[PDB]
């Protein structure tokens, strides 16, 4: 999976909206509480070059928040979120101003992938979705979801 | 959108649901979701109607359902109900490999679409999925699923 060249995380800081998601397995995304059904509300780069994700997810009939620190590696667009190196964040592309494309990747067994198209403003951006679909063309996706602007403004995209 | 020169005698026989898409995430986001239905068979009637033999997951088992799509004055457009709220639109087929169709509902407040890519054998057909993806580019879909060959053989499960 080819990641972005020359990523500057200092330029991705701020509030984002999960506009579209795709995954390698239907059960990762289909249910309201599916394991990879997580909404990115904020990206915070650290001075050390880590990227904090502020996530929301539906659990037990409520919206819950979680911070995930993705730690820097030798590749600037590849981050690790476990000490066992099975689970990664891959940044595929961004223009910084409008959209960011990233994947959660698990390579422990069958690779697992869950990818998102983030936008800076809670509107549909057809350019961002086109770039998302082109980025995914090489990957073995079996489910895609896309959200409307009303959903983008609500906790857990209700 | 709907194809020219449909011959319903040639769509007869065994199919498999390779891919599904819908206008609303809640139509497809569970085995229990209303549009999560697998086509087993199409049967043309002598009167030019098309019977859909369907399976749906209910409480951990496949339940079978037959819907009659009755012919209308527009080719490749079939009505399911007497009130004309529910329709089958046949978009395209080559008869021998794939069939693309959509269920449509126009009850207020919002129109619903749920489309499928059917294939003749329980194998992944990238050409069929590409034709399905091109057909969907014009429609306002918010969820899409495709099945692997294990899922294609195991019906609703
Ligand atoms: C018990 N189920 C685990 C999933 C919960 N999860 C949450 C919770 C709220 C928002 C996002 C996430 C995603 C990842 C994560 C990471 C660590 C603990 C819980 C969670
Ligand atoms: C694969 N086990 C955890 C499933 C959810 N998970 C995913 C999903 C796909 C690929 C990788 C990962 C690991 C990290 C992660 C982070 C936040 C939510 C879900 C997930
Ligand atoms: C493996 N490539 C499949 C490409 C088309 N496909 C997409 C597209 C983007 C994200 C996910 C998917 C998987 C399911 C699917 C279903 C129906 C039409 C296209 C697609
Ligand atoms: C709750 N909506 C109707 C139930 C599902 N339904 C759909 C779904 C989307 C669009 C049209 C229709 C029409 C009828 C029909 C027929 C067979 C399976 C599902 C559906
Ligand atoms: Cl979608």
Curated annotation (Swiss-Prot), chain B:
Disulfide bonds join 62-156, 102-115, 102-117. Pfam families: Lipocalin. Synthesized in mammary gland and secreted in milk. Keywords: Allergen, Disulfide bond, Milk protein, Retinol-binding, Secreted, Signal, Transport. It comes from the Eukaryota. The keyword Disulfide bond applies. One of its GO terms (cellular component) is extracellular region. The keyword Iron does not apply. Its main location: secreted. It is found in: Secreted. Alternate disulfide bonds occur in equal amounts in all variants examined. GO terms for molecular function: identical protein binding; long-chain fatty acid binding; retinol binding. PROSITE patterns: LIPOCALIN. InterPro entries: Blactoglobulin (IPR002447), Calycin (IPR012674), Lipocalin (IPR002345), Lipocalin_CS (IPR022272), Lipocln_cytosolic_FA-bd_dom (IPR000566). Belongs to the calycin superfamily. Lipocalin family. Under physiological conditions beta-lactoglobulin exists as an equilibrium mixture of monomeric and dimeric forms. Interaction with LMBR1L which mediates the endocytosis of LGB has been observed in PubMed:17991420, but not in PubMed:23964685. Primary component of whey, it binds retinol and is probably involved in the transport of that molecule. This is Beta-lactoglobulin. It comes from Bos taurus.
